[PDB]
Amino acid sequence: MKLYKLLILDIDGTLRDEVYGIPESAKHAIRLCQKNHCSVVICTGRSMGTIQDDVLSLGVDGYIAGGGNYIQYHGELLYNQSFNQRLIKEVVCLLKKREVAFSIESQEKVFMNQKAKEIFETMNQLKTYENNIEEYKSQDIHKICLWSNEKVFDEVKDILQDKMELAQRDISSQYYEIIQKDFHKGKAIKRLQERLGVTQKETICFGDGQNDIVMFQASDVTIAMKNSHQQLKDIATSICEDIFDNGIYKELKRRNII
Amino acid sequence: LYKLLILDIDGTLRDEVYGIPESAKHAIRLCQKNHCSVVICTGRSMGTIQDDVLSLGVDGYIAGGGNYIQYHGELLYNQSFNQRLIKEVVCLLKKREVAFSIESQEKVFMNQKAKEIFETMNQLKGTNSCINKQHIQEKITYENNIEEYKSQDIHKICLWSNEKVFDEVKDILQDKMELAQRDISSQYYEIIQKDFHKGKAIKRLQERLGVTQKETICFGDGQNDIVMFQASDVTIAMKNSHQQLKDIATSICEDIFDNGIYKELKRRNII
Ligand code: NA
């Protein structure tokens, strides 16, 4: 028997196409889920400060943000974890000395160096950013994005040690997405479930990236798309259609959730 | 033997015009050398705390008037208002056309009337300020940026209005709020979260550090420090402090640049 109480949705490439935004069918699906007593919670690597306006306009029940460091539900901030400030200063000091592209994030802003800005500029050309790393001083930081060799990464691991884990890793581009140990999307989903009195069996998620693989152990059903990260597709319960082929709506309709 | 020195910023540790005296900096180093932790306890957010305070190398920071607690870099507490309630309040105050500001831990969001209140407070820097010194910041330029508020986590609402407009804010927030401070003559209300005032914050840290009220000494100045005094054994004010704080204070120490903090600590054999 299945009666879902929690829909977990990733934003980028799941709920929302990076170029064409959110399809009406997904907005409708969300509205229908909520009518059927199934909470809809955004579960994103984005911070509340970088979540897009169209996502904020949906009236979802909660937000798991920063890749799992921040949990808000029905407006109430439940969890908001940030790295030890002294450890961030050491990392920032190291990474400036190493002259590698990097960024750090608070729940409001992304602080990035020149090399990192140049990476995001080029990412956008393959569809403004500022060298503002010197604006970091006392903000609460929950994520470090690093483009470097294995040696520079090991130096960051020597500073953070057991306090960190990788949310995501792209070997080819030398990219590491560093978050706090046990504050990935999966752990946040569990914390939220525990606050709401919802079980794993009552939870269904939709993801697309490597940062969504962790959603699986927190969910009964995990849905990916054809274009999703292969490791996610390999463990997904099913593959729904692409964003603008009404994948979320159709998947929810097939499972009789809406 | 005291284990926790709680220091206020504005009007106690730091003079609004002249900054922090060397005796205070030296007294902090001396307390730490004697295994007494030094923790800043301010209405300021980590984002509005002045660089000279950040350069001191204090053991921790109780910020936002008590919603935020950090110790040895470790963020221990960081409470923010319900986002939906803040939307209602922001919506209500825009239509009532009163000066107001809301604060996140990084930033202050203020309407036009509030920008003008703050510009004037900076122009009046050096005069007997009381509350103005708690808001003055040379770091930023003030501006009508309330429309930039959307999803930021908010812990404080500053309101300049009649009690009708305040009663309307109280109807929305109910027992989720309390007044950290209030200046009746200027119609000022400093609205914080219920049970996240300076004393409750001091008590959370005491609990975590395993330090007692008896092992805690505080230095305060404003109406917002009355509660600070209630979570401490020895409470120190100054001659120009808020009278209600002076009424409950253990002692009155000398003015900032008369080395009050150092002299009081030396007199008590803490340093
Ligand atoms: Na994604």
Q: What is the DSSP string of B172-239?
A: HHGGGEEEEEEEGGGTEEEEEETT-SHHHHHHHHHHHHT--STTEEEE--SGGGHHHHHT-SEEEEET
DSSP string computed for A194-255 = HHHT--STTEEEE--SGGGTTHHHH-SEEEEETTS-HHHHHH-SEEE--GGGTHHHHHHHHT
CB A69 within 8 A of CB A183: yes
Contacts of B145 (CB under 8 A, 6+ apart): B109, B110
Looking at beta carbons, which residues of chain A come within 8 Å of B90? Answer: none
Residues B248, B18: Cα–Cα separation, whole Å: 28
B151 and A48 within 8 Å at the Cβ level: the answer is yes
B76 has a chain A CB within 8 A of its CB: no
A74 has a chain B CB within 8 A of its CB: yes
A174 has a chain B CB within 8 A of its CB: no
Q: How many helices (H) and strands (E) does chain B have?
A: 10, 13
Of the CA atoms within 13 Å of residue B219, those in its CB half-sphere come to 29
CB A101 within 8 A of CB A118: yes
Looking at beta carbons, which residues of chain B come within 8 Å of A108? Answer: 104, 106-107, 152
What are A161's two structure tokens? Answer: 């040690």
The DSSP secondary-structure symbol of B145 reads -
Residue A189: what residue type? I
Question: What are the angstrom distances between the C-alpha of B26 and each of B60, B159, B265, B266?
Answer: 17, 38, 11, 11
Task: Provide the experimental method for this PDB entry.
Answer: X-ray
Q: Which domains does chain B have, with CATH numbers?
A: 1-79+195-271 (3.40.50.1000), 80-194 (3.30.1240.10)
CB B152 within 8 A of CB B80: no
Residues B46, B62: Cα–Cα separation, whole Å: 9
A52 has a chain B CB within 8 A of its CB: no
Report how many Cβ contacts below 8 Å link chain A to chain B: 60
CA of A254 to the centre of ligand 1 (A): 23
CA of A18 to the centre of ligand 1 (A): 10
Pairing between strand A62-65 and A39-43?
A: parallel
Residues B125, B133: Cα–Cα separation, whole Å: 7
Nearest-by-Cβ selection for B78 from A51, A86, A140: A140
What phi and psi values does residue B245 have, to the nearest 5 degrees?
-75, -45
B150 has a chain A CB within 8 A of its CB: yes
- Strand partners for B188: B160, B183
CA of A191 to the centre of ligand 1 (A): 21
Contacts of B9 (CB under 8 A, 6+ apart): B40, B42, B44, B49, B50, B53
CB A184 within 8 A of CB A67: yes
Residues B226, B158: Cα–Cα separation, whole Å: 19
CB A68 within 8 A of CB A187: yes
B70 has a chain A CB within 8 A of its CB: yes
**Which residues 86-115 on chain B approach chain A with CB closer than 8 angstroms?**
104-107
A57 has a chain B CB within 8 A of its CB: no
Which region holds residue A37: left if phi is over 0, alpha if psi is between -120 and 50, else beta?
left
Residues A145, A179: Cα–Cα separation, whole Å: 9
Residue B234: what residue type? V
Looking at beta carbons, which residues of chain B come within 8 Å of A77? Answer: 79-80, 82-83, 153
SS3 assignment, position A11: coil
A87 and B73 within 8 Å at the Cβ level: the answer is yes
Q: What is the resolution of the experimental data for this entry, in Å? A: 2.1
